[model samples]
Each structure stands twice: as C-alpha cells, then as structure tokens.
Target: PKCPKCDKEVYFAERVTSLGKDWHRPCLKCEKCGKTLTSGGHAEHEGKPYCNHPCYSAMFGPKGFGRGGAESHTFK
Candidate 1:
C-alpha cells in the first residue's frame, strides 16, 4: 500500500496491530513530527488509533486516554 502522508510504499509486514485493519508501522509516524510508533505507542481516540501520546491527549484529554487499564500523562 502507499503511505497516505509520505506517498511511499508501505509493506504489510511493518504493521503493529493485527486488531483492525493492518497499518504500516512506519506510516504511523506523526504527520506533524515524524515520530515512530508501535501498537503500544498509540492510543485509541473516537474508535481510531492515534500515533502518539500528544496526539492522543489532544484528541481525548484528561478525562480520557489510558494504557493497560491505567491512566497516563500525554508525554508518558
């Protein structure tokens, strides 16, 4: 597949999560900052997974955002 932001070829093997649709791990990098993220590095927001903690908190704030059944700071 082609990366939505970078327009580069994305291999399926680079996917982090096999939960929903397979997404390229490299493609999951922050569109604004270019940080690499794995499944554990992402957070769910409005049913979709965000690439990083900052983006996750911006989408879901103090009342939301968690990992492994625990709450964490946006930078954590």
Candidate 2:
C-alpha cells in the first residue's frame, strides 16, 4: 500500500512489488544508478534495491574496483 521511494500510497493498478513492498511502476529503481528493476531480478541491501550486475556487485561484492572501463568512473 505504501511506496518506499515516494512514501505515498500505491494502489493495485500502479503497484510493482519488490523488496517486500509495493512500489509504484516507476518507483522501483537502483539506489545508485537509478536504473529501473524488476521484482526478484535485482539485489537488495538494508532495504533498498539495486541492479545486480554493476551497482549492487560493485558496492557489495568481495572484490572492488574496475566495475566499468577506465573512462567510466566507478562509485566512490
């Protein structure tokens, strides 16, 4: 019923469930990169969702750095 991103109500028609909560269709996105994500197809930390390939792995993975090419700077 509540969306974590907007902290507003999400009705059934606009709901997309992820991270154990119902989010608006456009509300579920990566906390770092801001890319939209699908339910159960991404990663979660604390309670926020992140894309698994780069954002989540780069931040939470065992190894660090080199998530992207040299020209593309990684998260600080």
Candidate 3:
C-alpha cells in the first residue's frame, strides 16, 4: 500500500493502515493542526482525514457535530 504523506509504498513494519489506506506511524496526522492521530484518535470527512474535529471547528464545527449515545442531541 502507499502512504498519502510521502506518496511511497508503506512497508509492513511501519504500516499504520487506516481510512482505507496505508500510512506511516508518524504520517497519520491531522490536516488542520498537525496533531498525530494514532490508535483510535481520528476523524474523517469525504473519506479523508481532517485533523481532530474540535480543533478545526470552522470546517467540522458543533453545528452538525453529534456525539450520540450519552451525548445524543448534545451539539444542538
């Protein structure tokens, strides 16, 4: 698989597969604030990564933000 950050093939050892592609451990970062999105920390838009949601509120703002479950109807 290819890494979106470097546009190179991701090796098995350093692979950080997510969002339907391969990425390096350090390559999977937020597009807005450059925060590292490791493990379960990630958000998506148009199938692409756009940093942490709250960090880029103008684009991923609270207007349409819904946390569901205990936070259902919380972002209204």
Candidate 4:
C-alpha cells in the first residue's frame, strides 16, 4: 500500500499504520520534531503528522507548547 505520509509504496511485511492508514516506518514522523510515531502516536492536521498530544495541540489544537506552565518575555 502507499504510505499516507510520503505517498511511497510500503510492502505489507514492512509497513507502519497510523491514523488508520498505511505508512513507511521512517516516513511516519512528526513534522516539527521529526519523531518517529508508532502506536499511541499523536494526531494529524492538514495531513501533517505529529508526536505527542502537546505537539499536535501546539500546532493545531487550542493548546500550545514551550513555557506552558508560565512564561517570561522581554521587549527588544
């Protein structure tokens, strides 16, 4: 089957499935961090895959990333 992430063919014996579709093990990765996702992996948005819930949320959902608990910024 063709990998959803890369559109490259993956043999049945060596294929990874995420988001209910087939993908190459190496192709299935987070767009931002490039983490390899297997089972219990993160979700996708705009067809781009992600790693953790926080990562996915940071890019798509209302949730965000970096300095989540608190933050400090300065004027330049």
Candidate 5:
C-alpha cells in the first residue's frame, strides 16, 4: 500500500510492526507536527493509527499517551 501523507510506497516486510495495510517505517509521521515518527510513536487509539507523541498529545491531550495510567513507551 501507499502512505496517505507522503505517498511513499509501503511494505510490511520492511516495517517493524504491520497493521491494517502495508506501511513504511519512515513514512509514519506525526499528523500534527509532520515530524518523522518512530514505531513506538504509532500508538493505536480507538481503532486507527496515529503518528507520534505530539500528535497523540494534540488529539487526546498530554495524558493521551497512556490513558489507562500505563507507562508510555516507544519503539527505538
């Protein structure tokens, strides 16, 4: 599949985590700041995938990373 934002070709085999359709690792960017996001940044909320810490914070507020009081972690 192709990335919605950058239009880059996505492949699951090359990605650290595969979800929905094929997506590129570098193509995942913060929907808010437009910065490149890491694998840990793409946290699943509700049902869709969001890019990074800032993006998640913007969408759900500062406490959005772990709403359940769990520690927020990211992939390196």
Candidate 6:
C-alpha cells in the first residue's frame, strides 16, 4: 500500500498502519517530536500523527494544566 505520510510504496516488512492507512514504519511518527507511534497507540491531527503524552496534548489538548507528568521520560 501507499503511505499517506510519505507518499511512498510501503513494503510488507516496513509497513505499519495508522489513520486507517498504510505507512512506512519509520514514517509513522509524531509530527512534533519525531517519536515512533504505532497503530491506535498515538493521537492524530489533520492526518498526521503525534505522541499522545505531550505532542498531541500540548499542541491541541486542553491548555497548560497538564505538564511534567511524563517530562522525565525521554526517548533515546
């Protein structure tokens, strides 16, 4: 299938699905933070995916109240 995010053909080994569409495993990532996100394992906006913890919540969820809950956690 064709990946909506990268507009490329996604082969089986490198394929993942999100937003009801096929995606390259590496292309399915948070729009802001670049963290990897799995199908139904993250949040989406305007067809793009974002990490539910901070990227999604911070950019679109309710205002400043939610902060530092997972701040200590870091990827790589």
Highest-scoring model, lDDT: 2
Please estimate how well model 5 matches the true structure, expressed as its whole-model Cα lDDT. 0.55
Worst 10 residues of 2 by lDDT: 67-76
Summarize candidate 5's per-residue lDDT along 1-76 as a digit string, tens digits: 7655345666657554545555567655555556766656565444345664655655665443444534764431
Residue 16, candidate 5: Cα error in Å is 4.3
- Give candidate 5's total backbone clashes: 1
Each candidate structure's TM-score, on Cα atoms with residue i matched to residue i, is 0.42, 0.64, 0.57, 0.68, 0.41, 0.64
lDDT of each: 0.54, 0.76, 0.67, 0.68, 0.55, 0.75
Q: List runs of model 5 lying over 4 Å from the truth.
A: 1-9, 12-21, 44-52, 60-76
List candidate 3 segments past 4 Å from native. Answer: 44-48, 60-76
Candidate 3 residue pairs in backbone clash:
none
For candidate 5, list the clashing residue pairs, or say none. Answer: 40-75
**Which of the predicted structures, 3 or 6, would earn the higher TM-score when compared with the native?**
6
Q: How far out, in Å, is residue 3 in model 2?
A: 1.0
Q: Give per-residue CA lDDT, model 4, range 30-52, as digits (tens).
A: 88777877776666666677877
TM-score winner: 4
Score candidate 1 by lDDT: 0.54
Candidate 1 deviation (Cα RMSD): 8.4
lDDT of 6: 0.75
Q: Which stretches of candidate 6 lie over 4 Å from their true place?
A: 62-76
Q: Give the TM-score of candidate 3.
A: 0.57
lDDT of 6 by residue, 1-76 (tens): 8887777899999988766677888887898878888757787777677788678877776664544446564331
Local distance difference test, candidate 4: 0.68
TM-score of candidate 1 on Cα atoms, chains taken together: 0.42
**lDDT by residue (tens digit), candidate 2, 1-76:** 8887778899999998766778788877798888888866677666577787688887777774545557766553
| Candidate 3 local lDDT, 1-76, one digit each (tens) | 8887767789988888776788777777777667888676776554346555664454566554453446433323
